[PDB]
Amino acid sequence: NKAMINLHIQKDNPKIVHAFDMEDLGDKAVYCRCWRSKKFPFCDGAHTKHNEETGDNVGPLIIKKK
Amino acid sequence: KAMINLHIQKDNPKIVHAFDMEDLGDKAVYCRCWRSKKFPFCDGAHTKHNEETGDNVGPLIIKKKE
Ligand SMILES: O=C(Nc1scc([C@@H]2CCc3ccccc3C2)c1C(=O)O)c1ccccc1
Ligand SMILES: O=C(Nc1scc([C@H]2CCc3ccccc3C2)c1C(=O)O)c1ccccc1
Ligand code: FES
Ligand code: FES
């Protein structure tokens, strides 16, 4: 608990928060929780490379319809 | 040691959560910092993380439209 989690994303914003209306989502949204996506706040699979390199076990959050 | 998640479910090699819109309330707030004691939900722990590390991470909000 010394290192930043986010290294590069919107560093002029002092607290990055995203808010979406569930009515605006498609059938599925896949959100990044690793701060390595080139499509942040969406997951683009960059968590696998992170986990591979660091031995971590992070992954995305999926919001979907039943 | 450049891991993002330090302590959460470390017997799981890739932590992914998936929720159905239909089961959510008016507002669900999800943790993107891996420091919440209520993970995958946000409990405010990101502020302490940001202050300690100089980071700027925060949660993902899924809500019903106005
Ligand atoms: O890691 C990625 N996606 C992941 S990881 C886990 C899911 C879960 C798996 C099971 C599952 C079961 C029921 C309903 C949804 C899901 C989704 C998904 C997904 O639906 O995309 C990824 C990789 C490269 C580019 C973009 C995204
Ligand atoms: O609604 C919640 N949090 C919200 S709503 C808006 C913010 C941000 C937005 C950006 C921002 C930018 C600079 C300074 C403050 C803020 C506030 C936050 C936050 O957590 O920091 C919530 C948290 C835990 C449980 C339940 C609800
Ligand atoms: S790219 Fe960050 S969780 Fe998938
Ligand atoms: S406790 Fe992790 S984003 Fe709020």
* Associated small molecules: ligand 49I, the ligand O=C(Nc1scc([C@H]2CCc3ccccc3C2)c1C(=O)O)c1ccccc1, FE2/S2 (inorganic) cluster
Rough shape of chain A? Answer: globular
- Oligomeric status: homodimer
Beta-strand portion of chain A reads 15-25%
- Label the structural class of chain A: alpha+beta
Q: Please provide the count of β strands of chain A.
A: 3
The order of strands across the largest sheet of chain A is 2-3
Largest protein-protein interface: A-B, 44 and 45 residues
Q: Number of helix segments of chain A?
A: 1
* Radius of gyration of chain A, in angstroms, nearest whole number: 13 Å
Can you write the helix and strand succession of chain A as a string?
Answer: EEHE
Q: In percent, how helical is the residue content of chain A? A: 10-25%
Largest sheet of chain A: 2 strands, antiparallel
Cα distance spanning the termini of chain A? 37 Å
Summarize the structure.
The first copy, chain A, is an alpha+beta fold. Chain A has 1 helix and 3 strands, in the order ββαβ.
Describe this entry's structure for a reader.
- The structure is a homodimer of 66-residue chains.
- By secondary structure, chain A is of the alpha+beta class.
- Chain A has a domain of 46 residues.
- Helices cover 14% and strands 21% of the residues of chain A.
- Chain A has 1 helix and 3 strands, in the order E-E-H-E.
- Chain A has a two-stranded antiparallel ribbon with strand order 2-3.
- At the A-B interface, strand 1, helix 1 and strand 3 of A face strand 1, helix 1 and strand 3 of B.
- One FE2/S2 (inorganic) cluster binds next to helix 1 of chain A.
- Chain B: It catalyses: L-cysteine + 2-oxoglutarate = 2-oxo-3-sulfanylpropanoate + L-glutamate.
- Chain B: It is a single-pass type III membrane protein.
- Chain B: Its EC number is 2.6.1.3.
- Chain B: Keywords: 2Fe-2S, Acetylation, Iron, Iron-sulfur, Isopeptide bond, Membrane, Metal-binding, Mitochondrion, Mitochondrion outer membrane, Schiff base, Signal-anchor, Transferase, Transmembrane, Transmembrane helix, Ubl conjugation.
- Chain B: Homodimer.
